[PDB]
Structures are given as structure tokens and as C-alpha cells.
Design a protein around this ligand. Structure first.
Ligand code: K
Ligand code: K
Ligand code: K
Lengths: 256, 256
């Protein structure tokens, strides 16, 4: 499509405008609140002049630069054996959340090598896993529909059931799980589920990382298994690009 | 098959071990240094009590959640027109830097659907322009090599030249450009280059977002264009998956 790039440009433009009108006033009022609360904090202690608060902000911005927390009790220990097991998984999945990242040059270069040698490995593993699940699921579905009441287009209904299963278990139900275990309303839950599935990983919402919470010994592992199952399920429709694309576009000639 | 998953488990285990032994010591030193700097800020300021520092830290962490900068002069305006355009560009690329993200429930709910409708669109567009570039490069290389001496391996030489060209232009050379314009030592530039090429996007390093730096008027657009071309070259190799995979491993059967 020679007009596909024009579509891209128009889409980028309108999305930028909507994001502007939606978020910019919030950012302005947030900055204004930050400024007035800084001023109020200065009024709380005139003995601490503006420069003292500047130095405080500098120490804070450098602590946040070295990974440690800001609020207090920065004893989460993101870099121990059970947790680095999880950070390694979000690297080889191209999620790259952003709440934790290497800070040492040796560590940075090792992370480069680890990604370079693992991302292809992890992607092939996930592709094979998803292909195996898809094959076995189609086999069992066909065996049930043929031994039972046979259908003319059972394959269409089968893939419909499969896609609704995926969308239900990965974008609708997890918001309710995280509502009770992570204290997120449905909007944040859906937002985090989608950010994770697409391997976008903004990292502003990460499950199983909250110092003021109680988690089971194998909770983060359950979350990681959920993430990997999501990526595996997605791999099928990633591979069905042209097949499903023409399958759905064959009827578009009637609609347009 | 089932042995591959064992490879994955051992890979994750050793990666977690090395990542621990690398960052965990420096993370502990960072935490202790933050603690000691806190104690120094406390002792140097008598009127600033422990609870006062707690309140300041909480207010900073609260504003830092909204996206504002902690340092000062947060006049970057990540949500003006061009910055929103570039953010939209990163979102639909599965990069998700995660240094900026929508903080409004309406904004998050809109970003979910924006991703849903753009990520497949942008992936298709990148794949199309990549196949275009690859076909043009292939026909040009063949027209050049058929004039002079040719061979069956000639196409293999063309593939090798294209591989090394991509490696140089997107992985090895950019660190020098960013040493010039961003003042990153080579390891930082290489780390950032790889992270953005593999669509990990940790967001610790982003090219073109610095309040104190003085960038050109088209700097960010050029960076984004280079990113798009890099991901196009990446997709070209992605679609070259199994052509080289099964061709070479069978050649070693005759070697023994
Ligand atoms: K990604
Ligand atoms: K990311
Ligand atoms: K990502």
C-alpha cells in the first residue's frame, strides 16, 4: 500500500493531538502542585533555604539513579536470587519494564550480551510452546466436535472460542485478581495487562513488587508463568498474520 | 524439544546468578550510601527532623509519580505536540521506554486502545518498508555482482555485507554519535543502542530528552527515523529465519 505510510502519519498526528489534549493539562497541574508544595515545604522551615531543598532533590535524583527507592525501607532487594530470576525473564521477553535496570558498566555490558544471546532463544522457545498448545488444542477441539455433533465450519467457531478464551483470561479476568492482591482498580488492571501482553512494558505497574505487601513464596513465579502463557498464546496470532488476515478480508469485499 | 526448556531454565539460573554477583554488591553500596547521605543531611540540619525528611521524600516520590522531574527546570514538556508525536511513535513500536507514561485514567484507557489499533498497524508498515528496502538492496547487489565476477556464494557475500552494515550502522557506530551529541561513554551508547534495537526500552537512556542539553531542531525526528530504519533492517533478518537455520546445520553431517 503506497498510502499505508500516509495512514501511519495521519494516525500518529491524531494520536499525538489526543494525547496532548488529554494528558498535557494533567501534567501542567501536576507541575504546579509540585512547585507550590516545594514552596510550602520551604515555608515549613525557613532555616532550610531553597538551596538546601535543591541539594535534597539532588540526593534524591541520584539515589533514584542508583536504583534504590525514595519513600523508605528500600529493603526490597531486587537483586537477590529469587528476584533476579524474574528480572532476567523480563529482559529475554523484550518487555524491559524499567523499574529495575543495570547500573554498572560491567553489568551493563553483561546485560547487552545476555539479551543478545537470550532474546532469540526465549522467542524460539515461546514460539514452540505456543505452537504445541495450539496444535493440541485444535486436535482436542476437533475430536470433541466430530465425535459429537459435527459442524460445517467448526474450525471458525473453534478459533473464535480460542481467541475469546485468550482475551478473557488475559485482559478481563486478571484485573480482578490484581484488584484484591495488588489493590488496583479495573482501569489500572486492564492497562497493566495490556502493557505486559504487548511486551511494551512501561514499567510503571509491575506485579509482585511492593514492599508494603504480603505475597506468597511462589507468587512472582505465578505472575511470570501467566506472562509467559500470554506471550505463547499471542505467538499463534502473530504467526497467523496472512492466513487470518485474508480469512477475515475475504468478506470485506462484500462490506466495501 | 523437552530438552530446550531445560536449557532455558539453566540459562535463567546462571543469568540470575551473574546478575546478582554483579549488581547486588553495587546495589548494597548504593543503598548504604543513600542511608549515610540521609544521615548527613539530617545532622547538618537541626530544624529538619526525621519526620520532616520523611515528608519531603514522600512529596518528591508523589510528584515523581506524576512524571515531573525532580532536579529542576522541568520545562521539557513531554506532552507538547512534537514530544507527544515521538511518544506515540515509541508506543506503537513495542519499545515502551517507560520514562514517560500516561497518568490519567482516561489517558490509560485511551492508550490501551491506541496500542491495540497501532501496534499491528505499525508492525505491518515496518515489515512492508523493510521488504521494500531489502528487495531494492538485493536487486542492486545482484546487478553489481553480475557485471563483475559472480559465483553461487556471491549472494552469501551480499548477505554478509548487509549484516555487517546493519551491525555497524545500528550497534557500533551510533555510540560515537551519542558521545558527540549526548556525552555518553561508549558503553552507555552501546547499551542504549542495543536496548532500543531489541525493543526492550528500559528507558534509563533516551536520546533527545534532556532539559540542560541544547539539541538541534530536528534531532529527535532524526533519532526516530534512525530507530525506524533499524527496526526495518531487524525485521528483514526476522523474515530470514529458517533459510539459513536448516541449511547450515545439515552441512556438518558430511563433515563427520
Ligand atoms: K517489545
Ligand atoms: K519497555
Ligand atoms: K519493551
Amino acid at each position: 500500500g503506497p498510502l499505508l505510510t500516509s495512514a501511519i502519519i495521519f494516525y500518529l498526528a491524531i494520536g499525538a493531538a489526543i494525547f496532548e489534549v488529554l494528558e498535557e493539562p494533567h501534567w501542567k497541574e501536576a507541575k504546579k502542585n509540585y512547585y507550590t508544595q516545594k514552596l510550602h515545604l520551604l515555608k515549613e522551615f525557613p532555616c532550610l533555604s531553597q538551596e538546601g531543598l535543591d541539594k535534597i532533590l539532588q540526593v534524591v535524583s541520584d539515589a533514584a539513579d542508583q536504583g534504590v527507592a525514595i519513600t523508605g525501607n528500600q529493603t526490597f532487594n531486587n537483586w537477590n536470587w529469587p528476584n533476579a530470576m524474574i528480572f532476567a525473564a523480563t529482559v529475554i521477553t523484550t518487555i524491559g519494564y524499567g523499574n529495575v535496570a543495570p547500573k554498572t558498566p560491567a553489568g551493563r555490558l553483561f546485560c547487552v550480551f545476555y539479551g543478545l544471546f537470550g532474546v532469540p532463544l526465549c522467542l524460539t522457545w515461546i514460539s514452540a510452546l505456543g505452537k504445541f498448545f495450539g496444535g493440541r488444542a485444535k486436535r482436542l477441539g476437533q475430536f470433541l466436535t466430530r465425535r459429537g455433533v459435527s459442524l460445517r465450519k467448526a474450525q471458525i467457531t473453534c478459533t473464535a472460542i480460542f481467541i475469546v478464551w485468550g482475551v478473557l483470561v488475559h485482559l478481563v479476568i486478571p484485573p480482578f485478581v490484581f484488584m484484591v492482591t495488588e489493590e488496583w482498580n479495573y482501569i489500572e488492571g486492564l492497562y497493566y495487562s495490556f502493557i505486559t501482553i504487548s511486551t511494551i512494558g512501561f514499567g510503571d505497574f509491575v506485579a509482585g513488587v511492593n514492599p508494603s505487601a504480603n505475597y506468597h513464596a511462589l507468587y512472582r513465579y505465578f505472575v511470570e508463568l501467566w506472562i509467559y502463557l500470554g506471550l505463547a498464546w499471542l505467538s499463534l496470532f502473530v504467526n497467523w498474520k496472512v492466513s487470518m488476515f485474508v480469512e477475515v478480508h475475504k468478506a470485506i469485499k462484500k462490506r466495501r
